[PDB]
Symmetry: C3
Subunit: 586 residues, 3 copies
Amino acid sequence: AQWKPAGDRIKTKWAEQINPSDVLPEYPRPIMQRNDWKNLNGLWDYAIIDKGGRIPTDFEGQILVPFAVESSLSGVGKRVNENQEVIYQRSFEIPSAWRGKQVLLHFGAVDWKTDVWVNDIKVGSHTGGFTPFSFDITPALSAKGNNRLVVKVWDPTDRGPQPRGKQVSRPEGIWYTPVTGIWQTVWLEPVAGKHIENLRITPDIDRHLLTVKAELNTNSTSDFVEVNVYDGNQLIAAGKSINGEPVEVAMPENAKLWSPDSPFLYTLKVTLKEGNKIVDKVDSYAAMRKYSTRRDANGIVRLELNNEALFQFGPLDQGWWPDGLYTAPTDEALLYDIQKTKDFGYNMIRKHIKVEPARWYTYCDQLGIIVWQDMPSGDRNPQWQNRKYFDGTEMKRSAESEAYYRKEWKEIMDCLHSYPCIGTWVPFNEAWGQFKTVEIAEWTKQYDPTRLVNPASGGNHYTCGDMLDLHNYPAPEMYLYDAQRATVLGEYGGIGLVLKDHIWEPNRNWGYVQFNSSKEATDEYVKYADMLYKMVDRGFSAAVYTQTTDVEVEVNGLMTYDRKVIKLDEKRAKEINTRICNSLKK
Amino acid sequence: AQWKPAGDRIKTKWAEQINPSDVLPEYPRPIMQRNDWKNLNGLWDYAIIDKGGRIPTDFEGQILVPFAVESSLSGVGKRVNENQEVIYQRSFEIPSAWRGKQVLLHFGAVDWKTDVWVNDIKVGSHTGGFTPFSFDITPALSAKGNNRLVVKVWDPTDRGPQPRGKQVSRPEGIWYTPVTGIWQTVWLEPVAGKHIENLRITPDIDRHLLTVKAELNTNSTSDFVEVNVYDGNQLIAAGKSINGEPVEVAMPENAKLWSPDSPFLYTLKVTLKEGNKIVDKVDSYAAMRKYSTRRDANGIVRLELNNEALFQFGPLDQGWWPDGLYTAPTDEALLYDIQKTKDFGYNMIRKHIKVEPARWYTYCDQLGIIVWQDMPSGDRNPQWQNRKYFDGTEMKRSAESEAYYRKEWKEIMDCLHSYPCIGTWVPFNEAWGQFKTVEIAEWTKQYDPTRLVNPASGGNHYTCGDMLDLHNYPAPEMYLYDAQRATVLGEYGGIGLVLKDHIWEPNRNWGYVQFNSSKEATDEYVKYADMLYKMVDRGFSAAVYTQTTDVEVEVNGLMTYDRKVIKLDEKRAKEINTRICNSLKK
Amino acid sequence: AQWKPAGDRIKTKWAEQINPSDVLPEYPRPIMQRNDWKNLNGLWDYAIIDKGGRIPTDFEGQILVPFAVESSLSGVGKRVNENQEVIYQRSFEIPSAWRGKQVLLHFGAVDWKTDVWVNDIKVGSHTGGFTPFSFDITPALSAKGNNRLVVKVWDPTDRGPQPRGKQVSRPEGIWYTPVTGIWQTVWLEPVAGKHIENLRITPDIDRHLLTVKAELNTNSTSDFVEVNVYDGNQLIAAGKSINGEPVEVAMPENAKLWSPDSPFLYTLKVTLKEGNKIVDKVDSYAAMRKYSTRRDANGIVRLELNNEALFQFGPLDQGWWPDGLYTAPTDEALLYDIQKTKDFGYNMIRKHIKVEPARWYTYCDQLGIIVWQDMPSGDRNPQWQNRKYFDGTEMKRSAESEAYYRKEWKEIMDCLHSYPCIGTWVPFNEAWGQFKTVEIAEWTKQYDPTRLVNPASGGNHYTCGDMLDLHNYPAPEMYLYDAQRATVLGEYGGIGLVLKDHIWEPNRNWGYVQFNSSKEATDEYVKYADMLYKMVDRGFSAAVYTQTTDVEVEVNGLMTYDRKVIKLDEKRAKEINTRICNSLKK
Ligand SMILES: [Cl-]
Ligand SMILES: [Cl-]
Ligand SMILES: [Cl-]
Ligand SMILES: [Cl-]
Ligand SMILES: [Cl-]
Ligand SMILES: [Cl-]
Ligand SMILES: [Cl-]
Ligand SMILES: [Cl-]
Ligand SMILES: [Cl-]
Ligand SMILES: [Mg+2]
Ligand SMILES: [Mg+2]
Ligand SMILES: [Mg+2]
């Protein structure tokens, strides 16, 4: 059967541009680039089986990878419960030019538990629906050709304690449609026997230093790594190292620092050598930027970018699409939300309990958007004491649930470490699965000192981390203040507006405050923003407005769920949002 | 001299069948079978030196390996204190067919500290008297032949804090003769440079899956493992994996499940490949079975085998022999105790503070006997509060003693992991060396979730693990009950009966209750078992009778110490023991 | 310019003997000797730059390696603050006979953080100013010749929390000039591809055993180590091992035991084989000695050397030099302090919050001096409760400061493990940076049980470790006694005497007591020593007199700061010091 978008829900303009022969063709890993790769997106054979059932060899339907089974653009649009498993199967060829090289199989993200076979040979497994993973499949490849790839996915959604974000089995209110299966690009990559697996890039503008650690799959004493840094196409600095040492690149003192108003990116060329012969080399980019906090001349702790106080103001971006759920239909659509955030005068985005594909963060690096990265929530909740420092009963996770949280949080910080845009880690949000807050905040800060730590966005509040985060709806309000840290407003606004022919369901829509016209909503937004501007001088050092787009029945975004309508006046919002981003400028 | 059993104590009928040129010739590791091996059992040169003394080159007497120095069948029958060391010396030849192959020197068990030299070259060491260990002795061999094997053993018995079980220096009451030296078969094994060191087999009947993890001595990327599962001679399942991934084998949903009444075993054939070349291959077996606890329709937590409630009923088996102490004289003697347990209508055996050779657990796998595996006890004790939840002073082990416990307990669970018969781990018994009970129980359940955890058989009791274990003598009694877990009777009975021609000592013999004839003793057993049967509906979910055989002056077993007389009527006991084993049947 | 000692301060007689083309030429590592090496001491190019500044390629001045930048013998004599970095640069040729071999670059000690480049290739980094470290620089060597070596050094002194000893930015009273940069010999060494990195030598006189673990850089199964022990020229013991096992060498029962009165040293010859091919070979020494504590017949816990009670009595040696600061000008000078200690009748030396070069400890092994090794102090302090057991507020180190302490304390014990002279580890002194005393003392004893543990010299006092250490000035006093351990006097005396023309500064000189002639000071020393002798049978088991030499304004040593005048009468001191060392003789 011919592939068709499933369901009768609203769809973006990119839904009718989807070509099942060329689905999401852009390079999946701009932070470490090799020239050769093969995209495995497209139409795979799929099957939904009972958990523990036979993996079938004859399939009746097809799914469009990488769109989740519940999504419209998958061409399937079915539900998978905690007692079912999804089976992807496709054939693939290895290019003849790749002969003799190691072949890596890459997954951007699969929710939740993945088991992969190549020609009936198990090549690897993975748990965690937000992090990328790879397997070396060269021993399993066939000399004849027609390699068979089988992926077995399990996802209990909210019936299990794993990180899931807004995914629930019964969507209502603030909770959305579950996301199961392959939802990021799958691709093959040829590499040498010894190759760079990851680039750990860390800047230090105070020491005029750029550190690049090339993590290899295997090490030898004669290994040699060389890093070349380019301003445009002019080489401005270089570094070499052996013995697995991180490459310290001495940067020029007049280096161009990265910021939202001037997001300059240097270009990196990293080379690996066994002795004096080149075995591997990759392309990358880097930015000289610094995140910190410092008490200003008025006694208030501010968030600082490049040793200068900067008020961070941005929308809450949950990253949902009506046709692709977690997956943006095209690369132009993925970029669209970020560009509209710049067009609204913001300098920040809070990616809410979700991790995006690698291309999204690179776009924030290129466009100049500071990113607050949440840790996707899950499991049960303690009591939410949202307006005072927590004194209630601490919730105890099972040893298994705690292990999953710690494991996936480390993997998220690991795979997102080299991105300049990320400035703040947010381990918890509104007591969702919150546990051992002080211990996790200290571990997060100790693991990556270059970023700020938001211990719990909106509670539960503990005297730890780098900032106190208050939520309040609808208007901004400073009901709690930590003079020892920065005090921010991690969620406010939520002005709702129901624009028919552009909503997910005909009724039960809601906002924190509701109006019947775009003008009335823009007036209420400017009113809230005017209050927020006067509060910067009184204690608030950052703020997050809810939200970027409408999501399902929550119609309180700057754009409709299908992105076809901008709900608030852009020129009026840009005028005051710009004033707030420059509120601390000298 | 000529070899001759030492001492005038009672002996089993197999003591006169011992041939010192063919001592214990059966394959020592049925769970992982290669074809070629060489048995080093037999007459070694021995010497008892002062601790720290010089290792002599000339020797006066010989010892029969593998019988402990204190045992009768060793031909020595001498005592070794904590200020002495035992020195074994032996010459061995390597078969010419093994040329080019790696040669592994295997020890089944040596108590307690072992140091091994091959041609005056130290090849390894080991601490722990109950676990197997191996050394690669290939570089120490000589081309001229006549390799010299020297083993130095030290055993402080109860003068040290290490696990020892029932071994003491001054045997009396419930404490038996010390066991020092080599008490399990020593053998050689030829293997490839890369070979399978251990098979970690784990079933999952709920997911119709058999996971086989082949742990290798070295790993390369092109390593390939293939597992073939056979129902008799018919291949019914297969699995392949690379990258060190454990082999998940999809079992048929009609898979024959293992149980004491139907102990079916599948045959495994595991093959290791370096690329396309077969480099190693082993034979094994597996059983599809599951242990768990579930609350029944009456509100009582029951032990469940294969998702069905099953009452587990069996004898306490300390595994002691009058002539070989820890070592059964022949393989037919080792099997006899298990066979007589089956004949008395039991379905379970509690191996009491001892670990048996590998062939013993395989016999339980083949005959169909669930095994409760104790952790051999040692060190000092806290106060034993046997009838209430513990409230006294916790005992504090030294850092060295706790490390010895944690290490050997991990090693025991490691080498015994793949055995279907084992269903329950018992870290402590009657407060013998009991410390950090809750922490040890949680670590045990986390390290192997496929088995049940009995935190402390008979006390001290803590609200942890999978069951509450009461001891009571002589009659059964339910004086304490945990409605949140299963409640079991891990020790009861102990009906004594002195037979003149088949006891260890002339007097000082004892039972918990004593009768003068087999008829009277069987009357009391059927009396206690009738009480136990009614208590099954009342709360009890498992029970252990004391004991399998008489041991030294404790004459309360089903058989005499020398195994020549069955003390209780088998036909009357089997009829009621079978009724108790089927008590929870629906 | 041409090299010349800087400053107008007093200098030793060896300052005028320094030849800049032959500086400290003796072999830097007697505990593990290979024949071939190249000394890199001499005149390097140097530059003091801003922290984070450019590393120059052209230099204006030169420094005499290995003398610290602040020292006189460096030819520089300048101060480096925490916002500055020191840059060393020199060229070096690799001898042609070293071709094909691996070339290691050895640093004895650099304070505090070190980064090393060879031909602009980073070869390694290191933090910690008291431990040696090595780099394999072979892939960075150039075939043309004239290799360039660049060493960047950063040292915050007391502006950071790292271990620093007596170094402060503003020397006054008991605190002395900072020591920044390379202060121990830099040298090159050729080794085979597989070589012995370090020798872990541990004796056991109770088991007549010497254990030698040859720690290699890489491991193979075919590896083979042989250890030959020589009494003079006569081979008296040998041992061989494979599989990485430590070599157990059976020592003769009449072995010559090491002691201050008879410091016999056996000679070691360690050989590493790959199969039957010798690939590496090192020479070493070893001593059969044992440190312990036992309660004597009078109920007092004494320090025991070789299972016999021995009163350890020695001076406090801070190891400071007016011309070389931390670095002794010549090897003849490094020996002089130890020789005068022996000439004064002592048998022990407390190396105060400093780690000396390896030759210094070998000289203690050869001359017969027991060493109490302090952990160099740093960071902030809690309240010093010096006369009672601590009940005040515990000080909380930062996560970074605690890590630096634990890391360097392990590295100090690791590199000093094989030295016979070292008998006691002292983690803290007078509450300087004291934290988690009980945990650190238990970790220290568990890491090296062969040495005694002084938990905190002079406080803060906790019921832990092997001894209680009291400080009292000027006279001895036993205000606190621990009957469960030994009670020692780790600091007393401090008799001051100002000898003009031999002092650091003309003003602010001080002692704990001040006298005007050598006669008066010697009278007071014998008076304090007479008190100490009577106190031996009262509970004191060891004592430390302050101090070896004058250091800057603290003029209370046995010698002047320039080692030119013996301030106290040697014959009278030797007569009483010898009586105190033999006080526990039976
Ligand atoms: Cl091609
Ligand atoms: Cl290929
Ligand atoms: Cl490298
Ligand atoms: Cl509240
Ligand atoms: Cl006997
Ligand atoms: Cl061979
Ligand atoms: Cl594998
Ligand atoms: Cl090693
Ligand atoms: Cl070795
Ligand atoms: Mg999901
Ligand atoms: Mg024993
Ligand atoms: Mg310093």
